[PDB]
């Protein structure tokens, strides 16, 4: 039928990382360790005949400083029309490839140690070169057909020009997946137009994901290759691998263990990441959680843990980093 | 039980001050003369067994220019857990000392003439050197024990560094009080780490407050000493005194008279403040109000009245200032 919803999530924590780019430890009050804090309004209007209209406005919440930088709806601001033909969405939102593929990340793309494949590896100059969201986006999601489902999206560059790139921000991509019972598998392909050092560059991304729920435990993995290739030659390639396992502890408790490997070709360096986490649910809305992550940078790698609100910068080349995150996540 | 609330207050007025730092009079449409305008969302989830989870997001409203500078949740953005052990709060909020002690200000820390003890007397370089709120805050409030109640708070500096200060923003403090029937008394102590002129400085603040409701009238007072002491020597000290009386006028009317004295040692100057106000309630939600304030600066003192939205800057040394504020306050 028709309804309007005002909702959100406040997830704040105490965090700690043993070293920053200067070698000092850092600790304080951070946010979004289990789920990204947010505030949004959404609705669905039944137009009759299986046809529905909907809107969704969502922005991130920063409980540690009261959204000092302001509140906005950068997470999602869409209007849509859906029916048996599927669903068409207009407005900023996660692009189809990331919306579907981040579902295989047991840490939900947030907190100190989620899957970091979706990032701006080449220091591109586009606004969303981490391949997660896009402005001026138009999406189409098919209905489900015996497990099979797909999504396609296109984002207008609107002639944003940087250096020799005159179509910065353009996105073209989609995915094909099979979701049925305990099995889920997806293949996503996408290309964005951007600029690196003022030179036209294509950001090509292929991602394969799958997970299997065995009941007593769940297995999940991600395979991704992100290649920034400049028109004039020279490219930055990075392959990311991830395998994780999740298990319920009975009394609304959950344990998670995820391993990630980032093979950064451009600098011939690797980084190993291990995240262990526990989620204790006091209710369907409120949970207590703990995240323990370790990151080992090889050679020239300088990746760092994402302790949002405390420290999410890089570290000195070849340095290892350990981080802790303990907090409360409340949904409403 | 469990509930979610969307609320706020729109308080806008017409204001006038006979002189600014240039000696000219200033008048126009201002805000928050009786209560600070705000918009917020809050909720409480009964977890069973006396245990409750809650969230509170609140930001200030500026009706005169439609929040031209943007909307945020800088007033309060917390998530909390409470039970018979008391209450623990995480996120930006009033620090325990100001939350409790400003309750003795008959003008609720807003409008042209409230108690001005909570301010940045030394021109400190910290974000919240007026000792009112704090980022990265963790608070603990005890339950009430036969009138006795206390609150403690800690705010992480997160290594904010300015000059020789490498822990700017850190807060440590709390209060002990007795609240029963017509009597209320509190003692608050707090210390913040900051920087003045790029030099590490401690902002020490001790505040004593009490009020007695005699029914026909209410008596309230505040005693405070704020001392900014630099590590390398030299300090800025100011003692603030306040005594006020409030009285109901029967038909949902209220008269208020408050006197304040600010002894600014650093500049060996004093300032006398007298505020008279009337609040006429048309309902529990809507009220009409008028504020009349006079401020007399002695010698080098340059304090000015806070006519938010019109003029809240200082005045020429030794100058007296008179201000008027008339408006409507609507809560929802």
């Amino acid at each position: 039928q028709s309804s309007v919803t005002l909702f959100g999530i406040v997830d704040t924590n105490v965090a700690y990382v043993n070293k920053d780019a200067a070698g000092d430890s850092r600790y304080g009050l951070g946010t979004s360790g289990a789920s990204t804090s947010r505030l949004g309004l959404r609705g669905t209007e039944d137009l009759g005949g299986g046809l529905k209209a909907g809107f969704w406005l969502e922005g991130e919440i920063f409980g540690d400083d009261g959204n000092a930088s302001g509140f906005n709806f950068k997470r999602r601001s869409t209007v849509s029309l859906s029916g048996n033909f599927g669903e068409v969405r207009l407005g900023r939102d996660l692009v189809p490839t990331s919306q579907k593929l981040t579902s295989y990340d047991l840490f939900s793309a947030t907190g100190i140690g989620p899957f970091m494949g979706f990032r701006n590896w080449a220091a591109g100059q586009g606004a969303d070169d981490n391949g997660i969201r896009a402005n001026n986006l138009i999406s189409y999601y098919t209905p489900n057909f015996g497990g099979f489902n797909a999504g396609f999206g296109y984002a207008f560059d609107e002639k944003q020009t940087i250096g020799t790139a005159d179509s910065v921000g353009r996105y073209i991509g989609g995915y094909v997946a099979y979701d049925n019972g305990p099995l889920s598998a997806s293949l996503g392909l996408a290309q964005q137009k951007t600029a690196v050092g003022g030179l036209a560059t294509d950001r090509d991304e292929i991602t394969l994901g799958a997970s299997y729920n065995f009941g007593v435990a769940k297995l999940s993995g991600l395979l991704q290759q992100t290649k920034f290739k400049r028109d004039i030659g020279g490219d930055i390639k990075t392959n990311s691998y991830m395998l994780g396992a999740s298990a319920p502890v009975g009394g609304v408790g959950e344990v998670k263990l995820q391993y990630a490997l980032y093979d950064q070709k451009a600098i011939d360096s690797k980084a190993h990441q291990i995240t262990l986490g526990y989620v204790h649910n006091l209710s369907k809305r409120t949970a207590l959680y703990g995240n323990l992550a370790f990151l080992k940078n090889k050679d020239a790698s300088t990746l760092g843990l994402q302790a949002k609100g405390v420290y999410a910068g890089g570290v000195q080349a070849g340095e290892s980093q350990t981080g802790v995150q303990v907090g409360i996540r409340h949904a409403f | 039980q469990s509930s979610v609330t969307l609320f706020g207050i729109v308080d806008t007025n017409v204001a006038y001050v006979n002189k600014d730092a240039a000696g000219d009079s200033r008048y126009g449409l201002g805000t928050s003369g009786a209560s600070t305008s705000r918009l917020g969302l809050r909720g409480t989830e009964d977890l069973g067994g006396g245990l409750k989870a809650g969230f509170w997001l609140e930001g200030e409203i500026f009706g005169d220019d439609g929040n031209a500078s943007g909307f945020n949740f800088k007033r309060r953005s917390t998530v909390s857990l409470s039970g018979n052990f008391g209450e623990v709060r995480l996120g930006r909020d009033l620090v325990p000392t100001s939350q409790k002690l400003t309750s003795y200000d008959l003008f609720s820390a807003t409008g042209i003439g409230p108690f001005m003890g909570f301010r940045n007397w030394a021109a400190g370089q910290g974000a919240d050197d007026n000792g009112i709120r704090a980022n990265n805050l963790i608070s603990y409030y005890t339950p009430n024990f036969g009138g006795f109640n206390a609150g403690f708070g800690y705010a992480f500096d997160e290594k904010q560094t300015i000059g020789t200060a490498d822990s700017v923003g850190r807060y440590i403090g709390g209060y002990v009080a007795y609240d029963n029937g017509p009597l209320s008394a509190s003692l608050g102590l707090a210390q913040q780490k900051t920087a003045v002129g790029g030099l590490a400085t401690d902002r020490d603040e001790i505040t004593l407050g009490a009020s007695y409701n005699f029914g026909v009238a209410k008596l309230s007072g505040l005693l405070q000493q704020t001392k900014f002491k630099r590590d390398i020597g030299g300090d800025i000290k100011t003692n603030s005194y306040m005594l006020g009386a409030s009285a109901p006028v029967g038909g949902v009317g209220e008269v208020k008279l408050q006197y304040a004295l600010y002894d600014q040692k650093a500049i060996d100057s004093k300032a006398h403040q007298i505020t008279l106000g009337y609040v006429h309630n048309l309902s529990k939600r809507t009220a009409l109000y008028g504020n009349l304030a006079f401020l007399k600066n002695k010698d080098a003192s340059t304090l000015g009245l806070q006519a938010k939205g019109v003029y809240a800057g200082g005045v020429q040394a030794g100058e007296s200032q008179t201000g008027v504020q008339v408006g409507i306050r609507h809560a929802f």
Binding site: V4, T5, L6, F7, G8, I9, K284, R285, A331 | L6
Partner: peptide, 8 residues
């Protein structure tokens, strides 16, 4: 329509 919360 009355505004509902994330769940109900």
């Amino acid at each position: 329509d009355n505004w509902q919360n994330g769940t109900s």
